[PDB]
Design a binder for this molecule. Structure first.
Ligand SMILES: N[C@@H](CCC(=O)N[C@@H](CS)C(=O)NCC(=O)O)C(=O)O
Ligand SMILES: N[C@@H](CCC(=O)N[C@@H](CS)C(=O)NCC(=O)O)C(=O)O
Lengths: 326, 327
């Protein structure tokens, strides 16, 4: 964590006294727009254009992963450059230590720590230092560090400039999507963390049951049609998939969500391989980063730092859900 | 923890050592219970098979201790061997006689507080690990054996003339095959899962866990040829493999990170697991609460939180067919 301009090695902190962290922690909720107008929150004028915006991600984070997937589906590679922090999130938090294969270092300003860029945008900044970060190269500031919104910007803001066709938040499906997003976040995306980081046996039992209850639900839905809302791929699927692709390799063992493996569900496993095999998506998946990060960064639950050999799986097996449905 | 010169050490066992290759009690307890009281190949004589003399201190969580409980059922030795179950929580005092946990009985002979008190009684200045199972001699108030591989040999024959059920799980004809299996099954599986769970470095874990799955693969091949490891006869090699197998999905998979495959993913190993589990008398010896509680809560070095994972789903009651499939 990063308190009023200074870092604190998990020293967050001595306690509280006014009052939640803080008045600038989600002060990065601006929107990229096509006209430069401010979005529904934050301020303008971050207008969609080339060679201006940049992504700071870890390949290990399921939230940052969303933005990489949307970057591929929408053909935004020629508009949006990418920096990849080191997988080992140690005492300094996200680090620009390259050397780990696929780690790039701060390829813009050559900083040494992710928290440095947060300061370069607000030196009096109080709050968490998270990926993903959508960065304005021209104002040297943070547009947004909220992945749920970054993927919506990517969805339309670049269309006139030549983005690939696709709308992952179509006005018709929006209420279904917001609804799915609601419980999928609480019971699955964030669910596996509530379980893996649970404080007591009682906490863990409640969290992990929610996880598997929802999996049974999703298995059912997938079920009646190819994706969550029907025959159309939406951001609700992408948001579910980033957790799913990490489930068998990390969450099952590391976060003790071990009642069933994704590979045990007919549909969920098919869904997993489906999106996995979409052109361009496999390359955004890097299991070394994923596994090194979780097993080595979380000393409070895996003190030994040992990376388990991992549940067996083959994501390249043809899935036939394109045929099966509708 | 560990006893040093009669003194228990809360897991500072010891402050290194400076002396060094424990000990004069590394001689452990290796006497043999025999039919006529003659001495076995180690230890001394006088431990003749009889009623109301011998007792067994176990944990329901321990695969080694579990071997002796199973042999006790198969051979019908309940009339001759009484049993005490220590508490599953193995903390800073080692095995404990804390009842309160269901299945824990306290010390049914002398109501001690700690397993290590029994060791001290046998050897007031004992230096070594305080382990289960312990075969205790009520007459001479000492320890006969604390070596599970030998206790099962004793159970297998020592009582044959006093009413033990017919059955030889180490018969002359199969001894060579059995000894060979025991050798590699012990090093890569019974103890292999431990080498993996407690590996100090990533390299140590990598080598242990691969040998574990390499051996399961080999075992899967063997158990697709006949009902048991050596053919159509159950032997101690099966029993020794089984006690690990039954703990594999509830604990070793998650807790010891042996998670490439689940036993339920193997047709034959999973059949063999259900097959032995469903033999009369066997299921009573299995207590998943003791097992899952012991491993997750006791090993704070591996699992600081002491959280007990919900655990891989399984079902050992479903019929297995192995009684017919072969041969
Ligand atoms: N709500 C934000 C937060 C993203 C997030 O939780 N990122 C994690 C990755 S697991 C992170 O960088 N955490 C580091 C920290 O909290 O110190 C989002 O959806 O992107
Ligand atoms: N040599 C013993 C080994 C059994 C053993 O080490 N049991 C473990 C339980 S998993 C134990 O009592 N360990 C206690 C300790 O080391 O402190 C045998 O094979 O009978």
């Amino acid at each position: 964590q990063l308190i009023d301009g200074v870092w604190h090695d998990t020293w967050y902190d001595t306690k509280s006294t006014g009052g939640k962290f803080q008045r600038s922690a989600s002060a990065f909720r601006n929107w990229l727009t096509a006209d430069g107008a401010p979005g529904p929150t934050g301020t303008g004028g971050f207008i969609a254009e080339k060679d201006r915006y940049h992504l700071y991600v870890s390949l290990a984070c399921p939230w940052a992963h969303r933005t990489l997937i949307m970057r591929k589906l929408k053909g935004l590679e020629p508009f949006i450059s990418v920096s990849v922090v080191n997988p080992l999130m140690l005492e300094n938090g996200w680090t620009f230590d390259d050397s780990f294969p696929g780690a790039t270092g701060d390829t813009l300003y050559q900083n040494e720590f992710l928290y440095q860029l947060y300061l370069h945008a607000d030196p009096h900044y109080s709050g968490r230092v998270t990926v993903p970060v959508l960065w304005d190269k021209k104002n040297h500031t943070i547009v947004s560090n909220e992945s749920a919104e970054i993927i919506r910007m990517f969805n339309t803001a670049f269309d006139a400039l030549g983005a690939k066709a696709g709308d992952y938040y179509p006005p018709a499906l929006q209420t279904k999507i917001d609804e799915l997003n609601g419980w999928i976040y609480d019971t699955v995306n964030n669910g596996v963390y509530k379980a893996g980081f649970a404080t007591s046996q009682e906490a863990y039992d409640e969290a992990v049951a929610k996880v598997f209850e929802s999996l049974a639900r999703l298995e059912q839905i997938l079920g009646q049609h190819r994706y969550l809302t029907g025959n159309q791929l939406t951001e609700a699927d992408i948001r579910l998939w980033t957790t799913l692709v990490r489930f068998d390799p990390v969450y099952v063992t590391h976060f003790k969500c071990d009642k069933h493996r994704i590979s045990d569900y007919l549909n969920l496993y098919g869904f997993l391989r489906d999106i996995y095999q979409m052109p361009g998506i496999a390359e955004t998946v890097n299991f070394d980063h994923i596994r090194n990060h979780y097993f080595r960064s979380h000393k409070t639950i895996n003190p030994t730092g040992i990376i388990s050999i991992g549940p067996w799986q083959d994501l390249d097996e043809p899935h036939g859900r394109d045929v099966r449905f509708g």
